Symmetry: C6
Subunit: 290 residues, 6 copies
C-alpha cells in the first residue's frame, strides 16, 4: 500500500508543491521541474505515502524565501534536478547505489597491512539501556581505548552535535567492526568511531561516499596516522573519491600516483568537529533512541 512514483509526481505537482509554495510566500517566484520533483522523491524520501515528500517541498520553498531575502529577482526561478542539493543538501538516499548512501550509525574506515589497504565499515547501534558499551569484531586494546576516547569526547559535547543529554545513563552503545573473525587494532579509526557513534546517537545519517582515517585525542584533536598510500589506494579502488585525512599527514599525499590523487577529493582536518560537520547530514532520519 502507498502511492506509485507516477502518483507521487502528480500529487506533488498538483497539490503538495503549490501548497508549500504559497505557504512560504513564494507563489510566482519559484518553480520546480518534473525532473527535480522526481529527484526529491527518489533521493530525499523513503516512504509509502507523501508526508516526507511534502516536508521536502516545504524545505525547498523556505530555502527559496531565504534566497529572496538575500536578494529579490524578477520572474520565475526554476529549480531543476541539478539544483536540488543547493536546496535540500546532500542526497539522503541513493536507490541506484544503496551501499554508499548515508546511513545511521555507520562510517567508512580504512585499514592497512604489509601487503595493502582495506576498507572497513564501523557499525554502531544505540539502544535503550543504562550506559553500557560493547566493542566487538576482535578489536585490540588500543582500538578499544580509541572508541572510549571518541565516546568521551561526545559525552562532553552533547549540545554541539544534537546528542541526547542523558544518553550516558539511558542508552547502551555497541560498536562492531566486521568481519567477525579478523583481528583489528590501532588508533587510526578514532574519527571513524566518533562519526558512527555520533550518527547512532543523534539519528543523523553519516555519509558513506566518504572514507576516513585519523586518530582522535580526548579533546577532539585529529592526529596523524600511518599507511596513507595504502589506505587511499584502497579507497580509490573501491570507488570512494572523497577522503578525510589528518592535516599532519598532508606531506604523505606526495606519495600517491598523480592519476590517483587526481580523482580524489581530500579534506584535511585538525579537529573532529570538522569531520562530524562534513559527515553527518543535518536532519535526523529516525526517532530518538528513548
Amino acid at each position: 500500500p502507498g502511492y506509485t512514483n507516477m502518483e507521487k509526481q502528480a500529487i506533488a505537482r498538483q497539490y503538495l508543491w503549490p501548497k508549500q509554495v504559497r505557504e512560504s510566500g513564494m507563489e510566482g517566484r519559484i518553480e520546480v521541474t518534473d525532473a527535480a520533483i522526481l529527484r526529491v522523491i527518489s533521493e530525499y524520501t523513503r516512504e509509502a505515502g507523501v508526508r516526507g515528500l511534502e516536508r521536502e517541498l516545504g524545505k525547498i520553498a523556505r530555502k527559496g524565501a531565504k534566497f529572496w531575502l538575500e536578494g529579490a529577482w524578477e520572474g520565475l526561478r526554476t529549480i531543476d534536478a541539478s539544483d536540488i542539493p543547493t536546496y535540500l543538501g546532500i542526497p539522503r538516499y541513493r536507490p541506484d547505489k544503496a551501499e554508499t548512501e548515508p546511513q545511521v550509525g555507520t562510517a567508512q574506515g580504512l585499514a592497512w597491512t604489509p601487503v595493502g589497504g582495506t576498507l572497513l565499515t564501523i557499525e554502531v547501534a544505540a539502544v535503550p539501556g543504562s550506559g553500557k558499551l560493547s566493542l566487538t569484531g576482535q578489536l585490540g586494546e588500543v582500538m578499544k581505548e580509541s572508541a572510549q576516547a571518541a565516546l568521551t569526547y561526545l559525552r562532553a559535547h552533547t549540545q554541539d552535535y544534537g546528542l541526547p543529554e542523558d544518553f550516558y545513563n539511558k542508552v547502551d552503545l555497541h560498536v562492531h567492526v566486521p568481519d567477525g573473525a579478523t583481528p583489528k587494532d590501532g588508533p587510526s579509526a578514532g574519527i571513524t568511531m566518533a562519526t558512527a557513534i555520533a550518527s547512532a546517537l543523534s539519528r543523523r545519517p553519516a555519509r558513506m561516499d566518504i572514507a576516513m582515517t585519523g586518530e582522535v585525542s580526548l579533546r577532539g584533536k585529529v592526529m596523524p596516522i600511518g599507511g596513507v598510500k595504502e589506505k587511499l589506494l584502497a579507497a580509490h579502488q573501491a570507488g570512494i573519491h572523497k577522503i578525510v585525512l589528518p592535516k599532519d599527514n598532508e606531506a604523505q599525499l606526495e606519495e600517491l600516483p598523480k592519476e590517483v590523487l587526481e580523482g580524489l577529493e581530500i579534506k584535511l582536518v585538525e579537529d573532529v568537529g570538522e569531520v562530524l560537520e562534513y559527515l553527518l547530514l543535518p536532519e535526523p532520519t529516525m526517532p530518538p533512541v528513548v
Copy 2:
C-alpha cells in the same frame, strides 16, 4: 482428561466449524473435508480441549472471507487437507516427525571441520530477569561476539519482529549450543542465533525443517561464510532439504553434486529480516516471558 481425536473431529464438524463459518459471513460459500479437519487438529493444535481448534477454524473462515473480497465465486469452495497451509500457514506441529517441527527458541545451524559438516542446534531461553546474557556450550570468543551482535540487532528492531519493548531490562537470555563438552567457534551462526533469540523473545516458534548458515553484521547484513559444501552435505544427509545461505556464497553452490543440489531448496539472503520472516511462524504459541 480431554476430547478424543474422534470427538474433536465430530465437535468440529457439528458445532465449531459451522459457528465460525457463519460468524465470518461465509455460510454456504466454503466447506472443509474430514481430512482437512483432522489435519487442523493434528498439525495446528496441541491441547486437551478444543479452544485452539475453534480458533484455527475461525482463521480458515476469515481467510476464506479474504479470498471472497479478492473475488466472489459461485457454489462451494471445498478446503481439503492439501489446501490447509494456504489458509493456516506452515504446520505448527508434526506429531509424526516431532524433531523437525517448529519450536520456540531453537534454530538449526551447520558447522564444519576438516573432515566434514555437522548439524548443530542453537537453543535459547528467555526468562524473567534483568538483562543478563549467558552463552554456554564451550563457545569461543568470536562466536560469543556474534551472539552479542545478533542480540543488539534485535534490541534495535523490537517493533519489527514483535519483541517486548522492555526485554533489555526485564528478561535474561541464555544461548546454549549442545553438546556441552565440544568446543565451538566462529561467526557463521550469526543468523542462527538471531533466529533462536527472536523466537525465544517473541514466543513465535522457529521452523526446524530449515538449516542455515551466515554471519550477521550489527545492522543485519548477512555476510559470507565457509564450508558451504560440507555444511550442505551434512544438512542433506540429515534429511533437511531447505537451506538459508548468504547471497555472497551463491558461487560456492556449483561445488555440490547435481543430485544433492537437486533435492535442496536454497534461499539466498542479504539481510537478517529475510531470515526471520522465513523462519518464524507469525503467531506466538506461548505466553510472554513477563
Copy 3:
C-alpha cells in the same frame, strides 16, 4: 518431649484414624492394620507430636474414597503395611537406612575414570538471596555450564515443578559436589543437578535410592553420556538398584554382566521432566525458602 511410638500407635488407632475415616465419608469401608499404622509413623512422619501422622491418615482415607469412586465394594477393605505405598506414595523416611531416604536438595550422580566408576552426591542449598549462584567442589567449566543450563531450564518451567515464581531474584543457590579437594568435570550430571536444584527450590525431597546420569540440553532434552558400564557397576556395588539413563544409551546396556543387569531397574529417559517426575516426591517437606 513428644509421644512414644507406643503412644502414637494407640492415639492413631483410638482417635486420629477413626476421625479421619469418618471425615472422609469412609466409615465401615476401610481399615488399617497395626503394622500399617506403624509404617506410617516410621516411614511417613518425623516429628515429636502427631500432626503429621494425622495428616497422613487423612491422605489414606481420602485415597480410599477415590478408590470407592472408581468402584464400590462390599465389606471392609483392610490396608496392611505392604499396601501403604499405594495410598501414601514412596516412603518419605527410612529410619533403618537413612542414607538412601529422600532428601531435600540432593541427588545421586555417577562419575567415571580410567579405572572405574564412583558414586557422587550433588548437594544444593536454596537460601534467601538475590539470584546469585555458587558452584563449588572443584568443578570444571563444562560442569559449571551444565549447572547453568539446568537452572535456566528450571527458571523457564516454574509452574511445571511447583517452583517459586520469583526465585530468580529472591533466592541464592549453591551447588556443591563433595569431596572438596577432588576435581570434577563433564556434562553428564545435567539431570542430576536439575534434580537437586528443583528439589531445593520446591522443598520436595529427591529420592536417594535412584542413581542417575545424563547430559541436559537447555530445553530439557536428555542426551547420551559415557562410561555406562563403569557407572552402573559402581551403582550396583554401592547397593543402588534403580537407575536413570538416557534413552540414547540403551545400546550400551548390553555390555553389563547379565547378573548385574538382572538386579538393576533401569529407566530410560528422553526429557528431564521424566526424571523430575520419578525423583521428586510430590509434597514439600520443608517451608518455602522465602
Copy 4:
C-alpha cells in the same frame, strides 16, 4: 572505676545472692560458698560493676528451682566452686589462662605438613554490611570453597543456631587465618570455619580449649580428613586435650601413642550441628552486629 573483687564478693553475699534466691522461690533451700561466689566473679563475669554478677546469681537460683522441680530435698543444698559449672555451664572467662578461654568469632583448627602438625586459629569478624565475604591469610581455592560451604550451611539454618535472619544482606563477613604470609589450603577446616562464623554471627563465644578438624558438606555432613596423627600430636603438644574429629576417622586413632591417646578426650562427629552444640556457649556475650 568499679568495684574491687572484695567489694563484689561482699555485695554478692549481702544483697545480690539473697535477692536472687528469694525472687526464685528458693530461700532456705540453696546456698553458695565464698569460693563459689568468687568463681562466678572470675570465670563468668567481665565488668566494672555487678550487673552481670547479679544475672549469673539469678541463673544459679533458677537452676536450683529446676532441680527442686525434679525432686525436693530437705535442708540446704550448698553450691561450692566445683559445682558452679553444673549451674552456669562452661566457664566463660579464664583470667589465669586467657588464650584458651571462649571467644567470639574464633575456633582452633589443626593443619599438617610432611614434617608435622600445627595449630591454626580461624578468626571471623561479622560487621555491618551488605552480604560481602572476605577470605584472607593466603587461602587456597579449596579452602575458600570450604568457607563458602560452611557459610551456606549457616544461611540455611539461621533458626537452629540463633543467627540473625537477615545477616545475608545486612552483615559483611571476614574470615582470616593468620599468619598473614603462610599459604594455607585444604577442606579440613570446614567445621572450624562453621564454628567461627556461627560464633561471630550469633555473638556466642566458641570454646578455645577444644581443637578440631573435619571437612563439611553443604548439608552439614562431617567428612573424613588426613593427618590425624600429626594434628592430634600438635594439639597435645600445645596443651589442648579436647578434640573434635570426624566419625569416619575413628580407625586412624589407633596410630597414636597410648600415652597421648590417654590424655585426649575425643568427640567423634557425623554432623556439624554436633560440633556447634559442643563448641558454642549457649548465651551471647556481645550485642548483635546490627
Copy 5:
C-alpha cells in the same frame, strides 16, 4: 553574527568602559589605551558579542579601585597593553599561539627514554556520570596508581580548589595521554594529572606555557623524579620556558648547559597546592559539569 573587532574596540571606548568605570567609582582616575582595549578583546575574551568584554572591563575598574584603596593618586592612571596582566591576570587566550594558551582539562608533562626527553599532554574530561574513572593511552600500572592518588587528593580538597562537592558520585572522569599506541608508565606525572583533573573538574583552565614533572603522594607532597636533564632539554627545544620541578631535584639542575638554564624559569615545589595555584587560572571559563 557578532561584532567586528573594530566595533568591539569602539563600543568598549564609547559605552562599556565608561559605564564600568563610573559604576566602580573611578571616573576621572583611570583610563585605558586603545592598545589595552584590543588586548582585552584578543587575550581575555572569546565570543561573538561583548558580554565577556564588559565583564573584563569591570574587573579592570574594580582592580583600579583596589589600588585606590591602597593609596590614592592625583590625575589619571593610564592602563596600557603591557599593564593589562596586572589587572586581569595571566592571558586566557593567545590567538597568535593557540597551542600554548590555557585550556580546560589539559596539562603539559615531560617523559624520558634512554635516548632523550619528550613532551606529552595529559588530557582529562569531566562529564556527567556516577564516579567512574577511565585511564587510557596505554598507561602502565604505576602510572594508573599515580592518577588514582592525584584524584583522591582532589576528593579530599574540594573546598581548596573550588571543585564540586559531589563530583565523586555525579561525574565520570577520563584521563587520556596521547598518542594512543605508545606505552607510557611511571609516577612522575602525578602533579601533571592533578593539574589536568583539577582543571577539568573546576572548569578553570590550566596554563600550557608551563611544563611540569613530579611524583605526588596521597597527601600532596611533591616527590623527586628522574630524567631531569632530558625532560628540561625537551621542554626548551619545544619552546616552553617555564618549568615546575620537585624541590628535591634542585641538585640535578647543575647538569643543564648554562645557556639552557639561562632561558628557563624554574619553580621548585614541595606541595601540589603550589602547582595548582601556579597552573590554574582563578576564574572558570566553562559551565559546571552537572
Copy 6:
C-alpha cells in the same frame, strides 16, 4: 589576615587566659608564664585568629581544676613551658620540625631488605564515598590482605576509637605507600595501616615521632615480625627514637648495639588497641569526612 604572634601573646595574657581561668573557677590558683603561652600558640594552634588558642587555654584551666579536685594547694601554681604537655597532652604541631609532627591519616612504618632497613610512610585518605577501598604503591597480595584485616578490625570497633558508625557505606578509603614505583609486600605494616586508617577516619592525628612494625590479626593481636635489627637501625639513623614493636619480638632486641638501644624508647605491644592509644592524639583536628 590574622593576629601576629606578639598580638596573640598579648591578647592571651590580657583577655583569653583570665576569662578562661575565672570561668573554670580557678582565679588566683593558677597562672601561666609568657613562655607557656607562646608554646600553646606554637605547638597547639594553627590558625589566623585565636579561637583555637582560647580553647587550649580553657583546657589548661579545666585541667588545673582537676588537679585542684585531687588536692587543693596554697598560693599560685605557675605553669611554665615545660609543664604544658602535662595540661594539653602531646604537642599537636612542631613548626621547627614539621615532618615529625602529628598528622591526620599517616603513620611511620619500617621495611627491610637483604642490605638494610628503610622508613616508609603509610598514607590514608578518607573521603566521601560508598565503602570502596583503594590500595596503591605497588603493594603485594599479603600486604593488601593486611590492610583488609586492619580495616575489618576497625569496622568492628567503631565505638572504641571514635570512628563514624556508618563509614563502611559512606566513606571511601585509599591507602597509599610511596614511593609509587617500588614494590612493597609483607604483613608487618598491619599495625601501621591500622594506625593510619583509624587516624583518617577519626580525624585524630597520628604521631610521626614514633616508628612501628607489627603484624595484626583480625581480632587485633599484634604478631611477631622480621628484620628487627635492620628496622630499628633505620629508625635510629633517621632520628626517630620512639618505637612500637610486638611483645613476641622482645628477644630480638638483644641484637642491637647497646649504644643504639640506649637512645631508643621501645614500647612492646600485644594488642592493636595499645598502639592506637599511644599513636592517636585524643582530639580530632579536622571536621568529619561526611
